[PDB]
Amino acid sequence: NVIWSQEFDGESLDRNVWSYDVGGHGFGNGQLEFNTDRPENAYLRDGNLVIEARREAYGGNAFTSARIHTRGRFAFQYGDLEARIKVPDTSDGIWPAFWMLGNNFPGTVWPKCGEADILEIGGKDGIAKGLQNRQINCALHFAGVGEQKTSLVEWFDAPVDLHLDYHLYKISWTPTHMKFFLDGKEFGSWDITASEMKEYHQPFYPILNVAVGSWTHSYTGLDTPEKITATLPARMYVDWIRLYGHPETKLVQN
Ligand SMILES: [Ca+2]
Ligand SMILES: [Ca+2]
Numbered sequence: 001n002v003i004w005s006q007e008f009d010g011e012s013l014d015r016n017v018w019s020y021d022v023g024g025h026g027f028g029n030g031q032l033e034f035n036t037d038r039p040e041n042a043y044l045r046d047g048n049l050v051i052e053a054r055r056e057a058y059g060g061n062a063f064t065s066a067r068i069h070t071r072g073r074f075a076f077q078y079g080d081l082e083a084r085i086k087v088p089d090t091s092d093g094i095w096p097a098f099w100m101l102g103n104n105f106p107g108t109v110w111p112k113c114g115e116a117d118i119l120e121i122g123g124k125d126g127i128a129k130g131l132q133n134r135q136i137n138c139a140l141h142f143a144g145v146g147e148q149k150t151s152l153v154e155w156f157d158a159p160v161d162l163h164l165d166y167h168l169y170k171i172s173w174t175p176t177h178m179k180f181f182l183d184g185k186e187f188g189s190w191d192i193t194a195s196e197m198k199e200y201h202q203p204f205y206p207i208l209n210v211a212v213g214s215w216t217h218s219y220t221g222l223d224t225p226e227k228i229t230a231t232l233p234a235r236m237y238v239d240w241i242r243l244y245g246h247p248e249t250k251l252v253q254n
Pocket of ligand 1: 008047239240
């Protein structure tokens with residue numbers, strides 16, 4: 001029961017749904033890319049959203065990409081949100097993500113707003129073990145007991161090379177759980193009923209981005225332009241994002 005979707009069929013990204021996060025300040029992870037609002041980094045073509053990371057001097061950084069979200073235009077609480085994505089070869093450097101934030105961000109500060117990562121790929125462990133094209137994770141980031149940052153992470157070694165084709169990346173979100181799926185199969189699950197997880201019973205909005213690098217202590221382990229070996233340009237193809245409604249779903253389209 002699709003009740004909301006972006007099919008990415010047009011010639012340009014719909015600014016009446018999408019907003020750009022612009023900057024090269026590192027986004028609290030020591031990221032190297034400058035996320036721009038230009039057509040070179042986010043464009044539509046052949047029924048796809050393309051987010052393109054490039055090795056390119058821009059704004060004082062050595063890479064450009066894009067980070068887009070629907071805050072203010074689309075949010076929901078409970079439902080199945082799924083995206084058909086072909087990720088780029090991450091081959092040491094590239095850090096794509098499909099994730100969500102609570103709809104009270106940024107007024108409510110992170111992570112009290114709550115966060116759910118549906119797909120992340122390109123981690124340091126994946127690099128260390130030669131599983132760059134296979135190892136993924138989902139995650140919950142929130143204010144736990146005593147209102148302090150808590151992180152729950154579930155890793156999964158995918159069976160096939162994910163950058164070779166489109167796959168379906170989904171969250172199933174109910175009043176009791178958040179579950180995460182690859183091609184219909186569950187690889188993560190958490191109960192969200194506990195007193196410290198009330199942040200996960202409000203509307204959330206989706207985010208899509210392709211980051212380049214991080215601090216060494218952060219996701220990729222690769223903190224300088226010279227340590228980025230990945231094939232650039234790197235393109236993430238999104239065929240669509242669809243919300244399958246539940247009885248309890250609330251839609252926010254203001
Ligand atoms: Ca499409
Ligand atoms: Ca909490």
